[PDB]
Each structure stands twice: as C-alpha cells, then as structure tokens.
Amino acid sequence: GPGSMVNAFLAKIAAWLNAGYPEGVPGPDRVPLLALLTRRLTNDEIKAIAEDLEKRAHFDHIDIGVLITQMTDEMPREEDIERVRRHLALQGWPLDDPRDGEEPDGESGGPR
Question: Helix H segments across 1-112?
C-alpha cells in the first residue's frame, strides 16, 4: 500500500488528519477543517490528500474537495475553525513547516 506514495508534507497531512479522525470527519468539522487547511496548502496539495486517501477507499462521501466549494460561498464558524484546528493540533501542526512554501511577492505601490 503506502510506499513513498505522496510528497513528504502531504504524507504528514494525510497521517495527521487520519490520526485526528480515524472515524472520518463530519461536515460541521469538515468545512472549518478545510478553511484551516487550505490556508497554506495549494489546490494540488489539498487534492493530493484526497488522491492518496481514495487509494485506501473512496466509498466514503466525506470528500474534501466539496468543502472548499462551500467555503468559497459561505464560511462555517470561527468557533468551529478554532475547535477543529486545536483538536488537530493535538496530533500536530504540519502547516507551520511546508516542504514547498515559496509565498508569492509582486507588490507595486508607488510613493512620489
């Protein structure tokens, strides 16, 4: 099964999440989970998570992508984002050290 499948960071995320949720993530926690998660992870990464997990099984309708579609429209709750992030922090906080995190910079203000 698992054998250097996904990137190091992504493997950490999948494990970290599946460690915090061995029973799966319910919607009320999924939405804020994604809100928190998508902060520093790219579309390719968030997908990579799903891509790895479905390799295990995609019978579950706990899909991770759908949450982003909800978030783009309406945010869940700050309280829920708080409860989930801290609940997950118990297992770890990989989002602090991205294996690839070159944040863009194209600022053009202009004094006179």
Answer: 8-20, 27-37, 43-56, 65-71, 78-89
